[model samples]
Target: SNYVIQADQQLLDALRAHYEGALSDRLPAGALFAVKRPDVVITAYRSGKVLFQGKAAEQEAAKWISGASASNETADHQPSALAAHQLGSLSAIGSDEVGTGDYFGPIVVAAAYVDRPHIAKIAALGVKDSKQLNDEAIKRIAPAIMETVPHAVTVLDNPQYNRWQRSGMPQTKMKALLHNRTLVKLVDAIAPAEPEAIIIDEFLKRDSYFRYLSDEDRIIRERVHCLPKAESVHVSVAAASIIARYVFLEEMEQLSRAVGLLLPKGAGAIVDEAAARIIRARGEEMLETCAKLHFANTKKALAIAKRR
Candidate 1:
C-alpha cells in the first residue's frame, strides 16, 4: 500500500537537509518535513520515521535505504550475493529452504505467493534482505508481508531428518518433498487465488524432482518452474527465502537454548568442536536431537571426541 522506514537521526537529518527547500509547513502531526511530488508524498517525522506514499514510494524509499540490490562482488555463498542478479518478479508462488548446509538446526522450507503489485514491498527488504544482515529487516518484513501473502512453512527436525536419511532417503528427495508439501499447503491456503507460476529454487533437475514425488498422491507439477537462483528470477523466491531463514534462525536459537551451547550455522571446524564437546559432556544422543547427523561433520566430530 505504502512504504515506511524507521530512519536513524542521521538519515532523518539527511533527508530533511535534502528536501529543506521544498519542506511543507502545513504540519500533519509529528512530521518534521514533507515533500510533495506528482508521484510520491515523502514525509520525515521528528520521531525518526519516514513515510513514502503513492506510486513512487519504492524509488523514493530506496534513496534512503542505502543502495539498490546488492552488488555482484560481495563475499558470500548466497544466491543473491554472487552478482547483481536481477531482483526479478512476477505474480507467483516461490519456495526456498535454509539450514541444509548447517550442522545444527532443522531444515526449514517456506513458500510464499506474492502478487505483482506487492513486488515492490518485497524489494523494500534489503541489507539482510539476507546474509549477515540476517535478523533485522527479515524480522520486520516477514510478518508484515505474511499479513497479506498466503504462505506455508515446513520444518524437518533433526531426529526426523536422521531417520529419513538412515532409511535411505536422499537429501534431494527430502528437499523435493518438503518444497512440494509447502507448495501444496500454500495452494490450499489460498484456494481461489492463483499465481502465474510456482517456482522452486531448483535443488534438482526438473525431471529428477518430479521423479522423487512419483509415489505421492496429489502431485503438483502444473505451472511449476525449477531453476538455479530462482530468487534472482523472482521476488517471490527471495521473499520465500526471507521467511524460511527467519524461521531457521528462530529454531536454531530455541535449540541452542535447550542444548546450553550456541549452535553454529554451518558444517565447519567450529561445528566439529561443538559436537565433540557435546559428545564429551552429554554423549552423542544429544547431537541426535539437535543436528543433521548425516553430515560429514558428524564423523569428524566423533573422531575429535575419540568416540569412533
Candidate 2:
C-alpha cells in the first residue's frame, strides 16, 4: 500500500544516505529516492510531505519518520532497532474494553481479528490506540473498521453491571468474561486461520485473568498474550479499542436521551450531578437503569438527592 508523510530536508537526506539508493532528479517539487529490496520508492518533497509508494510503504515510511533503524546502533547511527524488529505480520485477535472506569454507561468489550492482507488497509485508515484518538476521529473511522474487519462486541449495560457488582463480581473479572466471550464469538464468525496470536491489553495478572474464566465452559485461553498498553503493540488491539469506544459512546448518547439529560462520562462531579438529577426526577430506581449504581457516585448522588 502507498503511504505518504511530510518530512524535513534533514530526514530526507539521512534516509537518502542510509538507503544508499539512486536519486531521480526528474521530479515536480522535490527529490525522489528508490530502494529495490522491498521495491519502495520515496518522494520527499520540499513541502515536507514524503510520499512512499510500495507494498512496504507503511512500514518503511514509519521507520524513517520515527528516525529509527533496524540495527542495534545508537539512535543517531541507526533507526529504532525496536521498530525494525516490530515490523512483520500484524495478524491477530486483539481484545480491548471501554467504560470500565466510568460510573455511567455500559462496559463494552470488543475483539477483532486482523489478518496480513488487511494490515496495510487498516494502517492507511490511520488506526491507533483509541485513547490517542478523539471521539470524533473514532466516529469517522469506526464504521470503516467494522466493515473491513471481522469483530465481536459485547456490552454489559449499567443495570447488568450493577447486578454483577452486587453479586461480588469485580470489574476485572467482568472484563475478562467479556474478553473471552467476545473472542470466542469472533472466532466463530470468521473461522480464519489459527490467529497468529490473541492479545489483550492487560488489566489483571495473567493468572488472575484465566482463573476468572476457569469456571466458564468453552473459554479460550490458548495463544493468549496480555500486556500493558498492548494496543500500541498491535493494530488489532487498536481496532478493537476503537470498536469498543464507538459502541460505548453510542450507548451513552442513547442513555442520555432516554434520561432527558446529558449523562456525563466518568465518576466525576458532573456525573454525580447528573445522577442526582435522575434520582430526583425519576426516583432512585431509575438510576439502576442508567448507571452502575454500585459506584460511590451512587452514594454521592443519593446524598445530593436527599439534600435537595
Clashes of each: 2, 8
TM-score of each: 0.68, 0.74
Error of 1 at 10 (Å): 25
lDDT of 2 at 178: 91
Highest-scoring model, TM-score:
2
For candidate 1, the clash count comes to 2
Residue pairs clashing in model 1 are 72-83, 126-129
- How many clashing residue pairs, candidate 2? 8
* lDDT computed for candidate 1: 0.79
For model 2, the run of ten residues with the poorest summed lDDT: 72-81
